[PDB]
Amino acid sequence: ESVKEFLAKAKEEFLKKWESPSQNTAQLDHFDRIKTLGTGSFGRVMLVKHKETGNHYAMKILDKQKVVKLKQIEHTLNEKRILQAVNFPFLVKLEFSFKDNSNLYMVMEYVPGGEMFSHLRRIGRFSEPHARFYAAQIVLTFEYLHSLDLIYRDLKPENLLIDQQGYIQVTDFGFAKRVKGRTWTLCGTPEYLAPEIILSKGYNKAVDWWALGVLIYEMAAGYPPFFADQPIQIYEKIVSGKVRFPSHFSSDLKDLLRNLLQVDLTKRFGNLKNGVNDIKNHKWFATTDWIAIYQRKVEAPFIPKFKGPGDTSNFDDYEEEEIRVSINEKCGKEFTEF
Numbered sequence: 121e122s123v124k125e126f127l128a129k130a131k132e133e134f135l136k137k138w139e140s141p142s143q144n145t146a147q148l149d150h151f152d153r154i155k156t157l158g159t160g161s162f163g164r165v166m167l168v169k170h171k172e173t174g175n176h177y178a179m180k181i182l183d184k185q186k187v188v189k190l191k192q193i194e195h196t197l198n199e200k201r202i203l204q205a206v207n208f209p210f211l212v213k214l215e216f217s218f219k220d221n222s223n224l225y226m227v228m229e230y231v232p233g234g235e236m237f238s239h240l241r242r243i244g245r246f247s248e249p250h251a252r253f254y255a256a257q258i259v260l261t262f263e264y265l266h267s268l269d270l271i272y273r274d275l276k277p278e279n280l281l282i283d284q285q286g287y288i289q290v291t292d293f294g295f296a297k298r299v300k301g302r303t304w305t306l307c308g309t310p311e312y313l314a315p316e317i318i319l320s321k322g323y324n325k326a327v328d329w330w331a332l333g334v335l336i337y338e339m340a341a342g343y344p345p346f347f348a349d350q351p352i353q354i355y356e357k358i359v360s361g362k363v364r365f366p367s368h369f370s371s372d373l374k375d376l377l378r379n380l381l382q383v384d385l386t387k388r389f390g391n392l393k394n395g396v397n398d399i400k401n402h403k404w405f406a407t408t409d410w411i412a413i414y415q416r417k418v419e420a421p422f423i424p425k426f427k428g429p430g431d432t433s434n435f436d437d438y439e440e441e442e443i444r445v446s447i448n449e450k451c452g453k454e455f456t457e458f
């Protein structure tokens with residue numbers, strides 16, 4: 121009943137914000153631009169500082185015209201509407217959003233510890249206790265998101281930031297969607313795609329649990345289970361039903377992974393009648409105190425090294441490009457609700 125009433129309140133609070141989303145809660149000239157932290161085909165993320173409060177934030181800037189060209193309108197609308205409505209210890213918080221003639225802006229908490237991707241590549245692989253600590257946070261986060269009828273659809277090490285306490289904060293809801301039943305969009309990163317996405321089926325929250333299997337494998341081995349030079353070759357391996365495990369994997373880890381990396385979605389852990397409890401009660405998680413993790417009372421495997429809230433040393437270097445705002449409004453109608 122403890123978990124039931126927690127998720128009931130979580131859904132109540134989500135739905136209230138979902139039905140009446142916040143809009144236009146800051147503007148660009150409230151901030152100073154510090155550094156570009158990441159950059160993609162239709163957007164980038166910049167470290168900014170609020171000029172009145174002095175607080176740092178990570179500002180995600182999406183070019184409206186590129187979003188339209190790359191067919192991400194609904195996706196960017198999803199991202200902001202979901203982010204302004206959710207609330208969970210392991211999700212990066214949205215602080216402000218707004219738009220102008222050219223761009224959409226999402227101003228979120230800055231997490232100076234960097235991406236799990238960087239730390240995993242630096243150290244090679246995480247021990248199983250270390251992987252398990254991160255994995256438990258993803259399990260709780262998906263339990264929360266799925267109870268809200270949300271699918272995340274972009275789990276990968278680059279999207280998991282490590283905060284000042286060594287805990288996970290999930291960033292980038294660009295593919296997140298509220299889904300009752302099934303959904304159909306081809307999206308994600310090739311290494312993490314579930315078989316039913318590759319095969320163009322109507323799919324559901326089970327694709328997140330598949331991706332957790334990929335993530336756990338990659339954290340514990342140092343490389344993902346399905347690897348190749350071309351995506352087509354990655355896809356052949358994903359749909360094949362075959363996965364090889366390093367000998368150093370524990371038997372418990374291999375057993376959990378076989379049940380998360382189950383190509384038949386109707387037999388995949390997290391998509392059975394017991395839902396998330398098949399994962400939470402698995403022997404590989406026997407040492408996990410789920411409440412202590414939620415409450416952030418467990419000592420973390422490591423604390424990122426950084427000097428303060430404005431330190432960018434854990435992120436990498438990108439060409440610094442203008443934030444140009446056109447004199448004329450672009451795509452006003454498409455992004456009315458933003």
Ligand SMILES: NC(=O)c1ccc(C(F)(F)F)cc1
Nearest residue numbers: 157158165178229230231291
């Ligand atoms: N919320 C953050 O602190 C954050 C930092 C960096 C990125 C990156 F995508 F650019 F890497 C995204 C988000």
